[PDB]
Design a protein around this ligand. Structure first.
Ligand SMILES: OC[C@H]1O[C@H](O[C@H]2[C@H](O)[C@@H](O)[C@@H](O)O[C@@H]2CO)[C@H](O)[C@@H](O)[C@@H]1O
Length: 598
């Protein structure tokens, strides 16, 4: 699923991703968190397909209308901005991203279509739609056209459809009524008919799309176009001398564009939600962050109050707000996708001439209304830590409960593959083999699991303790207190032993499996500890040090003389991770030579 530790962003290609990536770069320097900005095609329709399966970006940028459908499906995570932060943005933007009383996304910018015109060609654009035919006429004699804009997305045709009273859904009793659809109303039929009449009269071409309309205006083929703020950049790359003004009226009524609020939602499956929040609130939403995106591609009106006040001075931004006020914010209801899909058809079918305006719009109103559980799998993988080797074991029975078929299990080195013993899957590697990593006094690798259900590999971090890195020493103390002389031992006097390891391992639990004192030939061997417990009345276990160092006490009695001159204390220590099971427990033996005297 989503990669843990990194932020993946999806945004439409027309919007500045480069300016956004430059915001992420600033985020990397301070927090060292790499931000990947991508712009796939059909990210709005692609996101819900992948997100439902757990795959997708950590953050998605789109108009607000799509986020309610995502929300109602459970693909978005409710954002939790502080009241002090919400006041920094205009209240109406928070209304766009509010769903079921929850905030499902962060509003970024307010987007509304405007009329862009060529000043060199047309210093004073027409005030109304009705006079475009008379305009286009004057231009065609010069080998040009009055207006070109994308007819394949109803977003661009809606301003004319809603000018006479066309509407997607009526708002009553505080909610959008999905049974009541305004596509077939005479206001829409009047707008769409006007569009068709422009195509029939040759004033526009039905096949026109976005990239053709953008190429035509920037290259001087047409005097006017309808687009959003994002497009002003490429017009600047071009030398076109242009201006942004309010959309022309229709039947005396202003053109009502559907106003989207560019918003950043957080994936419901993303583990990084905290990072997404820290990035969006602290960095992306700011005077600087928004300016960085605006330099690459214009955002137009912004949700942030402070930065907005500066942007409103821009004539182009003032023109976008003027068009927004005359427009209606898009409903965020899940039904919008069916509405948009249905309206796109009617515009294309009616503009193509395949259907009459009444027949096309009437049909649109009808359509508008309209097992593996691999996360558990990794838990079954057991890490066995031997002295020289690490072995991974996966019980077959447990796998059966999960209903998964494992295609492969390996270490980092693909050469090392698990072997099937028929009751379990075992994978053994030497600490120096299979790309094992020796660091931090630990031997770490990853178990790469491939399941038939998912193409992507599953990775689980495995670790074993490296005892060669650790240094073991045997202390001996005359009293139950720290003392500097461990070398000499005396009979009949209590002796206290402490096992010290450097670098001290606090994470691991220390226990003494066995201890022995070897008096050599003729002296015999005395068993101080066995079976993890003290042996005999002369030995008793003590409490460990503040450090993990274990401790025990023993009393040494000799009946006869000569006393053994020298002896060696042997103690076998067991090391288990506080976070690990017994499988990962490792054992080492420590020896020390000591002088016995009396
Ligand atoms: O055309 C239907 C389409 O309209 C909106 O998409 C806009 C978007 O709001 C703008 O920010 C920009 O990306 O242009 C898009 C049109 O291609 C809706 O947001 C979208 O759901 C809908 O399909």
């Amino acid at each position: 699923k989503i990669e843990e530790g990194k932020l993946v962003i999806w945004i439409n290609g027309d919007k500045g991703y480069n300016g956004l990536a430059e915001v992420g770069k600033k985020f990397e320097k301070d927090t060292g968190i790499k931000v990947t900005v991508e712009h796939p095609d059909k990210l709005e329709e692609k996101f819900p397909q992948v997100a439902a399966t757990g795959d997708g970006p950590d953050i998605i940028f789109w108009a607000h209308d799509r986020f309610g459908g995502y929300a109602q499906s459970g693909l978005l995570a409710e954002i939790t901005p502080a009241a002090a932060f919400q006041d920094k943005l205009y209240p109406f933007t928070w209304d766009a991203v509010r769903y079921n009383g929850k905030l499902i996304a962060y509003p970024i910018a307010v987007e509304a279509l405007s009329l862009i015109y060529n000043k060199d060609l047309l210093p004073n654009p027409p005030k109304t739609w009705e006079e475009i035919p008379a305009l286009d006429k004057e231009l065609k004699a010069k080998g040009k056209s009055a207006l070109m804009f994308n007819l394949q997305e109803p977003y661009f045709t809606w301003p004319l459809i809603a000018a006479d009273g066309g509407y997607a859904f009526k708002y009553a009793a505080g909610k959008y009524d999905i049974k009541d659809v305004g596509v077939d109303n005479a206001g829409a039929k009047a707008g769409l008919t006007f569009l068709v009449d422009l195509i029939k009269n040759k004033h526009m071409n039905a096949d026109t799309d976005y990239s053709i309309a953008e190429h035509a205006f920037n290259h001087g083929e047409t005097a006017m176009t309808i687009n959003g703020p994002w497009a002003w950049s490429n017009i600047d790359t071009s030398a076109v001398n242009y201006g942004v003004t309010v959309l022309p009226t229709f039947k005396g009524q202003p053109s009502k564009p559907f106003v989207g609020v560019l918003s950043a939602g957080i994936n419901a499956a993303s583990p990084n939600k905290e990072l997404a929040k820290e990035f969006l609130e602290n960095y992306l939403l700011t005077d600087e962050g928004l300016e960085a995106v605006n330099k690459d591609k214009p955002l137009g009106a912004v949700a942030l109050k402070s930065y907005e006040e500066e942007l409103v001075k821009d004539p182009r931004v003032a023109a976008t707000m003027e068009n927004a006020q005359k427009g209606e914010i898009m409903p965020n209801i899940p039904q919008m996708s069916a509405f948009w899909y249905a309206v796109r058809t009617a515009v294309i079918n009616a503009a193509s001439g395949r259907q009459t305006v009444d027949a096309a719009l009437a049909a649109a109103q009808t359509n508008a209304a309209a097992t593996c559980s691999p996360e558990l799998l990794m838990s079954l993988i057991q890490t066995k830590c031997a002295d020289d080797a690490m072995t991974l074991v996966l019980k077959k029975e447990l796998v059966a409960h999960l209903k998964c078929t494992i295609t492969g299990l390996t270490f980092w080195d693909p050469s090392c593959e698990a072997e099937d013993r028929g009751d379990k899957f075992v994978l053994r590697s030497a600490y120096s083999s299979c790309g094992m990593q020796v660091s931090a006094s630990m031997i770490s690798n990853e178990a790469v699991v491939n399941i038939l259900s998912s193409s992507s590999p599953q990775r689980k971090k495995v670790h074993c303790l490296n005892m060669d890195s650790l240094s073991f020493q045997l202390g001996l103390y005359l009293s139950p207190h720290f003392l500097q002389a461990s070398n000499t031992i005396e009979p009949g006097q209590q002796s206290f032993v402490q096992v010290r390891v450097s670098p001290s391992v606090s994470e691991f639990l220390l226990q003494l499996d066995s201890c022995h004192l070897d008096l050599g030939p003729e002296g015999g061997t005395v068993e101080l500890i066995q079976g993890r417990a003290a042996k005999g009345n002369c030995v008793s276990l003590l409490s460990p040090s503040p450090e993990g160092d274990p401790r025990f006490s023993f009393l040494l009695h000799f009946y006869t003389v000569p006393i053994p001159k020298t002896g060696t204390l042997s103690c076998t220590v067991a090391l288990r991770p506080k976070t690990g099971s017994q499988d990962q427990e490792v054992h080492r033996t420590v020896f020390m030579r000591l002088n016995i005297i009396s």
